[model samples]
Structure formats: C-alpha cells, structure tokens
Target chain A: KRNFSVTFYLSKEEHDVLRRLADEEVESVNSFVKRHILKTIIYKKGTNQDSSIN
Target chain B: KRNFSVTFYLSKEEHDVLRRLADEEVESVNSFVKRHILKTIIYKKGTNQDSSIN
Candidate 1:
C-alpha cells in the first residue's frame, strides 16, 4: 500500500511531550499518529454506538 | 481512570515496525498501545461482528 502526508498543530509543550514519549518508544511521530488514525477508523466502523474515553 | 501494565512478546521486526511508527507520532509506546487497547474494547462492545484488519 501507498502513503500520503497529513498535517496538524499542537502546542509547544504538547509537541515536546509527545516527542519525548515517542523517543521512549523508539518510533517515529508520523508512524505513531498513523497507527492511531487507522485503528480509530477501523474501530468506529465496527460499531454503531458511541464509546467515550477519558 | 486507572492504568496498569501489560506485557507481550513480538519478533524483532514486529517491534521495530511499531516502534518506528510510534516515534513518528511523537507518542510513547505505552500510550500508543493503551489507546488502541481502550479503543478496541469500546469498538468491540459497540459492535457484534467479526472484523479483520490488514
């Protein structure tokens, strides 16, 4: 499969925090975000009801 | 909400892939994994089908 670019914004602190965390995992920020995006789409498509998280 | 630790084993390649992706998102592996786990529970509870992913 092919991939494309996506953009978004976060606060300076948020970026720092995320960067730090990603480093801990030894993963790239883009890959981390992409996985979440894919998982979310797949999960939502499976169910019809709402599932809230905190 | 409360948090707990979970452990699993993966091949070197499997881990490398996930870690790389996590780094791209600037998120920690634990956070990344946790979010997916939570979302999955929510999604599965909402639906009643056997869905597969690639």
Candidate 2:
C-alpha cells in the first residue's frame, strides 16, 4: 500500500531525463522510479551468487 | 547542484530494505536513490546499442 515516504533531489537535467523516459513508458514518475529500484535489487540478487539468497 | 526535488512513497518493507542498503553503503538515502537512478540510466544506455547514442 506504499505507506512509507521517501524524498530525494535531482538536478533539472536528470529530472528531465527521467521524466521523459517515464512519460514514454506511460507511467508516473514515482512508479517508474520505484520499479527501477525493485528491478535493480532483483538484478543484483540474481547476479551475486556468493551473496545470501533472498 | 540538486535544485530539483522529487518525492515518492514506499511501503514500509521496501523502505526498510533500501534504508539498510543505504546504510551499508554509508550514504544518505537521498544520495543512494539518486545514484541508483543515474547508474540505471548509464547501464541502460550502455546495453541498448540500437537506441540513439547518448
């Protein structure tokens, strides 16, 4: 239910880049960023065989 | 200079997981998330050879 909150700052250029991509994908910026974070965690977990398995 | 701001909400579980990882890397949560977003862009650009060159 996305109950907790987090905030971050980005340079205007970076924000523009992300906003463009997010809009291209037809997703909200928040959803896009959250999905990226979750995907990164999954990818990292998949690649690191020596790490504790999730 | 980080003049732009973005805010997103995370579920408690997701927030906890990210907070732990940020601590592990000895970075502020804002910094960690921003870094992740930038890194993802770089990685995607590197891999997508068919896309317009950045």
Candidate 3:
C-alpha cells in the first residue's frame, strides 16, 4: 500500500507536547502517530494487544 | 509501595475527550490513565515506551 500523507494543524501547546512525547518515545512524529493509529485500529477490532504481529 | 488513590480534576470537555479515546482503546479510565502515566515515566527515564513489562 502507498503511504498517504497530509498536513494538519494543532495549537502550539498541543503540538509541542506531542512532539516532546514522540521524542521521548525515540520515534519520529509520523511514526509515533502511525503506531498509535494502528494501536487504535487493533483495539477497535475487539482483540487485546500483545507483543506479536498484529 | 502500596496502591494509593488521588483525585486529578479535569474540565468536563477534557474529561470527555479522554474518556472517548480511552473507550476507543478498550481500556478502563483508570487503566488508561495508568498506562499513559507509566508511559510518561518510562519516557522521562530515557527509555522508549514499549509493549512489555515496565
């Protein structure tokens, strides 16, 4: 699948906090967002998460 | 240390957003807070958060 990318807006406070969190996670902002989005999808699918292929 | 309880107040809107997101994550409110709090701790400790024992 091709990657879809777009720009979004957030308040300075909001963006900064997330950027810091991403930094702390040792992941790029895009990677962190993608990961959490994937996690949300996994949660929505009614299966609990684990340390395995999703 | 033993388990302890504390009240951290939030605005209605803030609480609502957290509740909704937590629901999407399939976690109880307390569990969700604990997870984020733990994640923050790991992050601040110079370790990347992960899906394993903390």
Candidate 4:
C-alpha cells in the first residue's frame, strides 16, 4: 500500500495541464504523475546502462 | 505564484528513494518532483517535435 505521500505546488496553469493530461489518460492525477516519474527513472537507468556498456 | 498543489501517495521505500534523490540534488522533495514532472513534459514535447520534423 502507498502509505506515504508527498505534496507539491504548481502554477494554476501547470496544474490544469496535468489534470487535462490525466483525464485524457483516464487516470487520476496522482497515478499519472507517479507513473511518469517511475517511467523516467527507468528511462534514465536504461541510458546509464547503455553508456556503461559502451 | 504556485497557487495550486497536488498530493500523491508512495510506498515508504519509494518515498525514501525520492527524499534521498532530492537531498542529493540539494532541493526540497516538492521542488524535485515538480521539476521532474515539468522536465518530463518538456522532454516529451521535444520528442514529438523530432517526429514531426521527419
């Protein structure tokens, strides 16, 4: 279970953009943001792995 | 002004990881997450631009 939480501030416009994106994806804003962050971490790790292999 | 805010849940381990990453970057967790999300949006937009140019 996700027992811990984090709160962050954004400009009203930024918040609205995120909300629209979340709605488009049929997800809650929280889930959308969380998934994006996790995907980014994975992408960064993959880049690092490629660099280390070269 | 950042007049809007969002809250999201994470597991304890996920929260700790984010906090540690934020500390390493010398930023508050809120700032780190916010920056990350915005960066991701920018990155996606850039990717879209590249595709459109082709």
Candidate 5:
C-alpha cells in the first residue's frame, strides 16, 4: 500500500540485536523488520479491541 | 498500493477448527484470516499511529 510510514532510528545496540536475529533467519535485515512489524501490528490489534495501530 | 501477505500452515484438525470459525462468519479461511489481520493492524495503529502502514 502507498502509505507513508515513520521510522525512528535505533541505537547501535538495538540495530545489532535485530540484525543478528535477521541473520539467523537468513532474511535481509530489512525484510526481517518488515515481517515482524506487520505480524505485530496484526496480533496486537486482534487481541486489543480498543486499539487501531494505524 | 503495495501489499504482501502470507500464512501459517495448518493440519486437518486445525483446518476443521478454522471451518467452525468460518461457518460462524461465512468466510473462506483466507478471507477470515486476512480480515482479522487487517482489522487488528488498523485498530492497533489507529490509536497508536506512529508509523505509516505501507
């Protein structure tokens, strides 16, 4: 979808941690982050009735 | 709009469980799962809309 999104910079440590996990899954760091973001957005919204993670 | 979606695997028993949920909603498994994910993401993001959903 052509929606604009915000991205906050992470500290080096955070980035490294994420990168390490992505590497373990054999996905690019970018892809890993995107999948998790999408999955998380879905899971949280389904569980919480009052939220809209837009 | 650019979109990508995938799903988890399910055995016959899991499929039957899904059939029950679908019978209540009159939806195919795909539609049911998608709606849940989309609704959840939208709700979660709507209240906590810090990122733009891409």
Candidate 6:
C-alpha cells in the first residue's frame, strides 16, 4: 500500500529535468523520486538505506 | 545521448533527512536517489541487471 505519500508542486522546467534523469537511469520517475526521500532519512538515522537503495 | 531525468518536491523535514543519508553514504541526495530508482526498475524487468550490477 502507498501508505507513505507526499505531495509537492513543480515548475514545468523542473519537471522536464526529472523526467530526463529518470530516463537516463532507466527508472520510473515516481520510484526514483521516492528513493531520494527515503534514502535521505535512512542515512540521517545512521542506518543503511533499506528501501531507497536495496 | 544524455537521457532520462525527473523532478519532485519534498517537505523541509524530508529534505533534511535525505541530506543526512547522503552525507553518510558519502553520496549526494540526487545521485543516491537516482540509484534506487534505477535499481527498482532494473530488478523489475530483470534485464539490465543481467549485464551485471554494473
């Protein structure tokens, strides 16, 4: 379940950048987007990122 | 071709957490999150991963 969710707005240009990066990495923009947020918290807690990287 | 990218928004708290994770892994939040998205889809298709965790 997508119990974890957040919402934010982005400009058209910024949106384009993210889409490009995701394509290069061959990743879904949404998943890619989530990973960063998750990883950020995990690393901060002094724990290896389980969801973001794993 | 330089391809693939995306953009998203996060709460201030989320941003701070991710920053901490990036610091620990010695990786920037952008780079780190990109990796996870790549991994998720790679594993999903079970194709690119074959070239090696390269």
Candidate 5 residue-wise lDDT, A1-54, digit = tens = 232322224334445656677799855665665555446534645433543422
Which scores greater on DockQ, model 3 or model 4? 4
Fnat values, one per model, are: 0.00, 0.90, 0.00, 0.92, 0.00, 0.03
lDDT digits (tens) for residues A1-54 of candidate 4: 348777877666677888898899756887788877777776555323323410
Better of 2 and 6 by lDDT: 2
Docking class of 1: incorrect
Q: For residues B1-54, what per-residue lDDT tens digits would candidate 4 score against the true structure? A: 337878877668767888899999755887888888888775544222122353
Tens-place lDDT per residue, model 2, A1-54, is: 337877877667777877898999855877788777877776544232232466
lDDT of 6 by residue, A1-54 (tens): 122223434345445766687688855766666665566445544333334663
DockQ versus reference, model 3? 0.03
DockQ for each candidate? 0.03, 0.47, 0.03, 0.47, 0.02, 0.05
Which lDDT values do the candidates have, in the order given?
Answer: 0.48, 0.72, 0.48, 0.73, 0.49, 0.54
TM-score for chain B in model 4? 0.63
Q: Give the worst 10-residue stretch by lDDT in candidate 5 chain B.
A: B1-10
**Tens-place lDDT digits, model 5, residues B1-54:** 222334233335434655577679765765654454345434433232245686
Q: Whole-model lDDT for model 4 versus the true structure?
A: 0.73
Model 6 spans > 4 angstroms off: A1-54, B40-46, B49-54
Report how far residue A36 has shifted in candidate 5, in Å. Answer: 10
Chain B alone: TM-score in each candidate? 0.55, 0.65, 0.62, 0.63, 0.56, 0.62
lDDT of candidate 3 over B5-53, digit per residue (tens)? 3223333444455568789975566566545544643455542334554
For every candidate, what is the interface RMSD in angstroms?
13.2, 2.4, 17.1, 2.1, 14.2, 8.7
